[PDB]
């Protein structure tokens, strides 16, 4: 594998040095679009650009999308600070698109768990848009100590009943110090055009966070990139799992 | 930010010194209307008046509506005592209206949590009117000690199983010493006129207390000001939240 | 307020000394009607009579109906013993009627909790008639000690898991030593004649005990007097309350 | 009241000495009918006979039907042993009929709890016939000790988690040593002939044990004697009760 | 009663010595039919044969069917070993038929609990055929000790949370060492021919094990012999019971 | 029985030495087909081939399919390493087909528990395809120790609340180190052609793992081989069991 520390360096270097056919550093341009009047909160990164620049790294985001995306996001922060003199910008997402192989909902299985995959499909359902705690801060009601606990949208809420410093059992979730972002579920199934003869469309539930929330409604067909995540079924006692697609990138397709 | 102590002083000074086009101190007049035969229990404050008089403070009520409204209410109490020789008047509400930006139900999201927002919409549902304990007094059944515990209409009831003085586990809610006000839920969604082409109306549940209860019924379109509050969903184990609008001001709009 | 001890003295003196236009002590007469063949178990008291005789006390029953009615009932017991030579008569109810202001079901709110109110309305529902334990006696299955615990018809049953004398956890409810009276729920809402133009009738659930049970059925319009009581909603975790009218006096009205 | 010990003596003396118009000791005859080929398991006792012979005792069965019926049943056992030389006969029921006042289902209330009452009515429902443990024997799975615990058909099952001798928590219900009798529920309501003008028939659930099980079906109108018993409603937390009629005697009436 | 030890001796002697009209020992013949190519797993025993040979014992199987059937089955095992030189044969059932009195479903009651009864009726329902653990073997996951716990098809599963030897709480049900047989429920009610004039057919649920499973379907009228067993109703807190017929012998009847 | 150690040796020798009519070692060929471009993850083994080569072993897979299949799979791994110089190949399934006796769904019973059986039938239902943890790895959140716990698709998930090394109660399921395969339920019942005259089709639920998942849909008639497994019914307190067929081999049949 590729070191975390090192992976960032190669991502920084990719952003600032990759050029298209005419020599324009495209990622410089994109990183610039984070600074305008009505800015963007994320950088869409074309996998093919990355693969042509550093294919070893390109493969490591599909194999380890977690440390990969995190590395890229740190890198974006670096070039902002070093090259644009901007430190006080928020979380900026790294959103990879246009992956080598694009598979169908029916093709998704155990061999994808924790790996970035591209999926074509059609949106069947969309949730209402609720707040998610991306980072919860628990404050000790007694000694006043603060504890930072990042959360995961597909997992359950990780509380902490005991104070890490004084050890009192009087703790609460501090909504002001905590970090919320918009959250939205959606369902996506295989497109009935690519199927049948008497076949059954399979589906997959997925989640959308922050800036990519609300991009789609029922009927829209889409290409989405994401991580395939598993979580045990309701009862929490069967060795069988429920699969959710933590979306990293969406875009419509003109039918 | 602005100090609590200081924030009150600026609010007092705003109430007694702000004048309209002709020089009538309007808030003096309003504070006066608390003392008539069939009095009012609140002072509607026009944000624009405030902004023109002290814009730093005006912005601090939208950013910190909790300490802001509380400050204003204390100030009302001060001018009553100092300028009208009235101390025995009850809780008088500070109700801010006419905010700079007025957003739609569909626009409400994580970025509004704990911030005063203005919302235009249409009332879909209204609850029946129940008593709420705005302040509960728990009395020790054993040593007879009294404990004051203010409540929040959107949160759950905060009991106290242990006596703060003698430490006995025999305590009850004393309905006479406790403070009740009327409570009423309502639902408000985006107005179908400002939507569609095939779009879905989003909604938000909201709460009404004391003097503003029962001001509206299903069908009425309204402009409401309030705080966007979050509370975890039923199960209390998912890091996803339910959003409620603790209303600070309502008024109809003649359709 | 008025002392409990003293309040009784003034009620005794009201019963035996108040006379109508011709000088007949009406309450002497009423107290007498408790002693006939098919006696009554309560004395209806006309508020106006009381107000004209002792208005300070008359106001204290509307403000403190609990200690007020209780005081009056003790007084009845006194005149029975002192003036009729009767000690072995049961609980005799004090039932106040004809109060100064008579409000509607829609007018009932937080500002009435624990205060005697008069309400006009129409009966929508009536419960089946069940036994209520007005006074429960718990007996220790071990040391045989007896403990008296008066109950409230709108509250839940107050048990006692521990023996007050020997401290054994083997206790039961002794049905023979305990005191039961008939109990009956009913619903009353605003009369559709005093409403609408497109308005919604509000309702209130209420309870009837002992001699006043079974006085009314669905369709009958009535004027009832009673105490407005609150109790938390099902879950027992929301600071919102359910309101029940513990009836102190009912009478039909010929429509 | 009348002593238990003594009450038996007067019952024995009633059975063997009471004579009708011609001098036949009727209860001797009845007690004799317990000994034939297809015997009876109970003695029907005509209240009027008893009242004319010993009215003090006759009133004590209506006031204390529990110790009264029990006394009578012990007495039957005495005359069997002393006068018929029969000891090995089973439980023989004392079943009182023809009481002074016969009231209607709608008349039944809190003033009857634990008192023998006569009721006329019509059977609406009958249960299927299940076994009831009239006496449960619990055996210690460890030290083999036996404990006798009589049960009540309207109450719940009284277990015993702890051994009275060795104190082990390994105990079970021994079906062989335990005593079972047939049990059958039924519903009886006021007869529609004795009602209306727009009136609602009230009902009461009742239970039948052993030899009187299966005596009636839906449609049959009956006069039943029995004890009015109370037991708390489902939740077991409201001071309101459910009333059941533990039947002591039934007989049809030719409509 | 009759001793267990002794009871077996008389059963052995019955099997090998009872002869019909011509002197053929019929039970020798039957015991022989356990040894053929497609053998039987039970010996039907005609009660009348037994009664004529040893009526004291014949009555003890109707009074104590549990120790009686068990005794007979041990005896079959004895003659197999002693007279046929066969030890490795499985559990062979003793299935009694043709009892003196044959009663109807509606006649079955508390006076039959734990006694072999014959019943005529018609099959209304039959369960699907599931495996039952006739003998469960629990193995200690820690010290590897094995514990044998015979089960009852009408009772619940008797686990054992603690190891009888080392006392560890890590135990599981070992499916390989445990003994399973086929199980099948059925319902049988009184035949509508032997009823009515406006009468209601009563029913009884029953169970079938091992070789007698699947012998009947809905519509078939049958004569079954079995034990009447009781078990408490769902809640497990009312002293009322549910009755099930543990079938010991079935046979069709040509309608 | 046959030793585990030894059983493998005989299986290795069967794979590499068994030849058909022309002398081609068929299993060499099959093991070869695991190595191509789009390889297979299992070796279908024809029972008849095995029976003709080593019938003692052939019978031991039907009697002990668990240790049998496991032995065969180890053997496949041996020939791969020793004869193909391949060690890094995954789990490869041993899938036995064409057994001596092929029985019907209605014929399946307690006498098959834990034995490989062949079943003909028709597919009625098929589950959606979920991930199953074939091997769970639990990691200690405290001392970082790893524990391997193989799971069973028909059983429940076997957690481990205590750390095997440090003994901390802070443990979680590590999805990355854990092993997942696709899982799919299906229902199969007797074919209506081989039945009736007024007969009822019986059914059996079954499970498919890994490479054999998704091979069939409702309507397809099939011959499947598998293990008959039992597991207690929902409540987990009745000695009755639910039967599931852990499929070891499927194939369609052209109707
Ligand atoms: Zn702390
Ligand atoms: Zn205290
Ligand atoms: Zn005690
Ligand atoms: Zn014991
Ligand atoms: Zn052990
Ligand atoms: Zn550890």
Numbering used by the authors:
A (entry chain A), B (entry chain F), C (entry chain E), D (entry chain D), E (entry chain C), F (entry chain B): 0 to 254
Mind quoting what the paper says about this structure?
Hexameric MCM rings act as the replicative DNA helicase, encircling the leading strand DNA template at the replication fork. Each Mcm subunit contains three domains. The N-terminal domain (MCMN) possesses an OB (oligonucleotide/oligosaccharide binding)-fold and usually a zinc-binding motif. The MCM complexes of several archaeal organisms consist of six identical subunits and have provided powerful models to investigate the atomic details of MCM structure.
Like SsoMCMN, PfMCMN elutes as a monomer by size-exclusion chromatography (data not shown) but adopts a hexameric arrangement in the crystal structure. In contrast, PfMCMN without DNA bound is highly symmetric and shows minimal RMSD from sixfold symmetry, indicating that DNA induces asymmetry in the MCM ring.
